[PDB]
Amino acid sequence: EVQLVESGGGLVQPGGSLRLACVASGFTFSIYEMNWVRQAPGKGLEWVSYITTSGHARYNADSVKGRFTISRDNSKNSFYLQMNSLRAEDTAIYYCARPQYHYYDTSTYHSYGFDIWGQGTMVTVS
Amino acid sequence: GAISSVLNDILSRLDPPEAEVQIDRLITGRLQSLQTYVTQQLIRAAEI
Amino acid sequence: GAISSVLNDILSRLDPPEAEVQIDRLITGRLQSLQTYVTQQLIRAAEI
Amino acid sequence: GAISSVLNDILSRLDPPEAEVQIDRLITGRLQSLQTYVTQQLIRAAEI
């Protein structure tokens, strides 16, 4: 069964460093690249960063002001957002979601849109 | 014909007793280039 | 100053790591001869 | 670039298999000096 469980909340002043993780099980991590999406309280969800299957990272979306970093631990079958420099706006739910494009795929590439979503974690920050 | 086209490389990985041969090769080539250039410029100045 | 006056023989009994030196000697001789010829031609053409 | 500036010195303390290298170096230097001299003379002759 596919599932995306998270952990690592904490209250810190802007500029603080924490430890964020999105653990998963029941499916292959080797052929699935993972995204992250950010949803401020009462606001719309917004992606922040992601890692590819090979290991390349994209800190795009221009809402991350060089604050978030993404990695992945294929050895321990777990997925972490390599986390440091939390800031004021970062108080939000952190649903980690799984893109539809697994590396061993067929059909048209109407994928990379999320088929499943994590339960999300509330990391209150002020 | 030397091991490198720059003088600083051949002066950075060769002791002088082995480096001076290649230094001489580069110097003879550069002096031939200046001789050809000054010959060309000299008969060009005669035409001018 | 090479061991032979023809390029084919000196490229028939010498491996390239010692032969290229003799080849270089012969090449510098051939190129000096060609440059002397072209200087002579240039000032004969100036007189013409 | 030879070990001495006169021919009599380098032909008094070197057997020919090692001496001919310095002989060749000195001869090429002298031939390039004489060739530059005749080039200058020919261009000066054209101006005269």
Added chain:
Amino acid sequence: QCVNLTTRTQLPPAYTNSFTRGVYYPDKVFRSSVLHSTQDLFLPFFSNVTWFHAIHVKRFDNPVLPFNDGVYFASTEKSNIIRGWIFGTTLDSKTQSLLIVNNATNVVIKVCEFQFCNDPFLGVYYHKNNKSWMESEFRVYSSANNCTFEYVSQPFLMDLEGKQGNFKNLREFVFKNIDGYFKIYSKHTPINLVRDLPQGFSALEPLVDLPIGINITRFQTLLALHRSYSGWTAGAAAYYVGYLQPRTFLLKYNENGTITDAVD
């Protein structure tokens, strides 16, 4: 375990034109705004390259081609069929073999004495019960013997996908075997729905300089097949092979240090 799954269809290979493809960086130094001239093994412009494609129409073909002094590879890709190569000399018997491979997250380079069957493929299995897809299948080589070299790194074949519309992932490769060094060059270019090597220019980046020092004369390309339950067939693929020759090019460098066009 391996099996005689040939189902080979014989058709003449459609020679097609590449239009100024196959040039790479000859040296590891940053020039700019210069016309550096170089003499190296290059694919000549407007040359016949061999369009090989064993799919469409249970048409499967994967012949052994010689590594004649230089291989240019292209792989307009849709669903990840071309997975690697098995360069070598005899690709069987008691000789040395190379098994350049690109799995789902890494690149495995093995110079070893593998024994090969006639139809090598990489088989990915999908389960209903676990849903995991695993490469735990090995039918290009039966086993290994006196193994010599192993290398694990970031994979050459890189997705570089996520953008939409008609552009395609054209992956170009250059393999050469000069005195004991195995050099792999690559670049990947988006192409606006072209059914042919595009009319542009390429700048193939250096990938690895493998210290192998082997003969190699019979390069071959691996493919990946799913399982299904005409056993072990699947996909859609087309690739293009041409050969490098000792030639002389003149490269013109732009202001960013990258080449613009090459004049043969």
Added chain:
Amino acid sequence: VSMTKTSVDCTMYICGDSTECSNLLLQYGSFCTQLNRALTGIAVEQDK
């Protein structure tokens, strides 16, 4: 009637920013001295 005046520095052409310029120079520098005299004569002739 005229052509652009030019001059060549000996050290910066054949030595450049490299060591042993004197040892490189005492053996081969009078050729460059002759060429610099020729280039100065060309410049003076072009002004005249």
Added chain:
Amino acid sequence: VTLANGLTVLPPLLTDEMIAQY
């Protein structure tokens, strides 16, 4: 008329203004 390591270009004595004046 379009004009144009130790290589220096010596300017002419007679500048363009004074050649024009002559």
Added chain:
Amino acid sequence: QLVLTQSPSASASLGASVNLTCTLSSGHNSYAIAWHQQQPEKGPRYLMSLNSDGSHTKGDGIPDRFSGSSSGAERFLTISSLQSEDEADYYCQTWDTGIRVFGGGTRLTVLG
């Protein structure tokens, strides 16, 4: 990137039909989307990844009622015979060269 001119409030009677509209920037006319429905106080739910031809790839628990159509540079999601559960937030999202935009919400106050 593409911007969503989705009405902050649109409404109709229960059992009737409406069409939400996802508008897209002229620069990516032939781009596909996927729809996520965000019921309040829960997580996102993926309905369909809509092709430019209106074809379907369906998530679990979603009837044939929810369908998509395309025309020009804009996109539609179709709802027919509305019921109570339709009260939710609808999000239209896309793909790019490492960008997923996701646009904004479609708060729908269907009266019934």
Added chain:
Amino acid sequence: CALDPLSETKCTLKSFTVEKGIYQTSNFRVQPTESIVRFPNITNLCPFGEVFNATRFASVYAWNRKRISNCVADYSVLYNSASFSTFKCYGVSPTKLNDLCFTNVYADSFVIRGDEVRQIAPGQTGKIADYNYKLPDDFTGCVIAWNSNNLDSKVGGNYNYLYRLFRKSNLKPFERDISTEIYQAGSTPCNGVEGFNCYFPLQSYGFQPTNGVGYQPYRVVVLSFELLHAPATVCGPKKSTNLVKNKCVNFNFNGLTGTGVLTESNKKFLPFQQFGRDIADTTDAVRDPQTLEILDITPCSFGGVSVITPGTNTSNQVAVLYQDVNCTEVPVAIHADQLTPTWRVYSTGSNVFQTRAGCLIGAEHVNNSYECDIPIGAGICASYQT
């Protein structure tokens, strides 16, 4: 020859009397006096203990190649306890081994007999340089061999080591052959079984402690380098220092020696490039190994000094011409801080005049106009007048 511009002209003309006029003087003024060295900040010990302490050490028909990276090569450790018979080094002098930083190194390893140590060299032939291990003609590295009769040889004969006695064709450089197929001597086919005119290509060495100097094992370690190309991973034990930008200084980036000023550049390198030469034989572009910041290397001062003077009989007063400078940078370009004080009083003074030809210092300009005799080069002329 280093006190006055008139004496400098006297040196460049080889005479004790010079006439009035203009003389372009050569640059004998400044000698740089400082050096900075900056290398990558990896201070691991290279596995020379693994290569040079091999208890089980590879044979010659199938020799071992080990890649060495991300460490420092301390040559002084090896001869503390090991004595090398032939430390021949090709392309790189043994003296300058310390100051270089290598990029792609590899340690070959094989055991050969005493007579065949000479065969491990570019251009030599035999049954060890044709059928077992061939070195390339344009080789760049050093072959290190020493006697190992006590370790690699035991009583009764050590038959573990093998070599290719017969082979069908000559080996390519750095090519390994491990096949043990039967070699056919005659036209008859062996068909994979030993018979007449069919021999095993692998013959065994007969190392015995009672034989002579020619018949004893010699452990050979062949190192292969690539100097001053591509990014480098194996450096020498010299320590890295700070970076002094905007000033003329000797730099040592990864073994690259030179003299010149550094500024900040904005061009972007390729990922596989660490050096740069906008034009070859200039080496303008380089990456700082510590910070990976793209910079530039530019020359620091102009070659343009000339002397304006009357004849030495008339007067000893002299003026000097500094070309292609704004006059304010004359002491910066000349580097008069390390120069003689008699040259410094001519380096800077009260009467500074900027011409288009260059900076004229030592003479005073006038609003009146007189007839020219000697040139300056920008429509101005100088002469001796009250």
